[PDB]
C-alpha cells in the first residue's frame, strides 16, 4: 500500500469526485472503506492531478472516515470547507 | 457499491 496526501480547493461544483463505500455499503471482502469511483473532467481533483479512481480515503481534514457509514463520509467531505486534506491509500 | 455519492 501507498499513502498519499492531497490538498484540494473546493470548486464551484465541489471537489470533482465521487465516493462509494462505507460500513453500510455492499463490497467484496473485509474491505468496507470509502473509495473513489469517478473523477470529473475539469474538476478540482483532476486539476490537482494526484487523485485516482479506486483511492481509499482514510481521513478528511481532522475527521477519520475509515470506519463510518456512506453518509458520515459524505457529510465529512461536504462540511470540510474550502481547503481539504485527503489522506488516501492506493 | 450500491450507493455512490458525488462530492
Residue numbers in the entry:
A (entry chain A): 220 to 309
B (entry chain G): 2837 to 2843
What did the publication describing this PDB structure actually write?
The human Discs Large 1/Synapse Associated Protein 97 (here referred to as DLG1) protein is a member of the membrane-associated guanylate kinase (MAGUK) family, a protein family that has been identified at sites of cell-cell contacts in different organisms including humans. The human tumor suppressor Adenomatous Polyposis Coli (APC) is a 2,843-residue protein. The second PDZ domain of DLG1 (residues 315–410, referred to as PDZ2 hereafter) has been reported to bind to APC, while neither the first PDZ domain (residues 220–310, PDZ1) nor the third PDZ domain (residues 462–550, PDZ3) of DLG1 has been reported to show substantial APC-binding activity. In addition, we determined the crystal structure of the PDZ1 domain in complex with the C-terminal 11 residues of APC (APC-C11) as well as the crystal structure of the PDZ2 domain in complex with APC-C11.
In the crystal structure of the PDZ1/APC-C11 complex, six complexes can be found in each asymmetric unit. Only one complex was found with electron density for seven residues of APC (residues 2837–2843, SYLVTSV), and the others contain fewer residues of APC. Interestingly, in addition to these canonical associations, there are more interactions observed between PDZ1 and APC-C11 in our crystal structure. The N-terminus of the APC-C11 peptide extends towards the groove between the β2/β3 loop and the β2 strand. The β2/β3 loop seems to facilitate the binding of APC by forming interactions with residues upstream of the canonical S/T-X-V PDZ-binding motif. For example, APC-Val2840 forms van der Waals contacts with Ala239 and the aliphatic part of the side chain of Ser237. In addition, the carbonyl oxygen of Leu2839 forms a hydrogen bond with the side chain of Asn244 at the β2/β3 loop, which is conserved in PDZ2. Furthermore, the aliphatic portions of the side chains of APC-Tyr2838 and APC-Ser2837 make van der Waals interactions with Pro245 and Ala239, respectively. These interactions are observed in most of the six PDZ1 domains in complex with APC-C11 in the asymmetric unit. When the structures of free and APC-bound forms of PDZ1 are compared, the conformation of the β2/β3 loop was found to change upon APC binding.
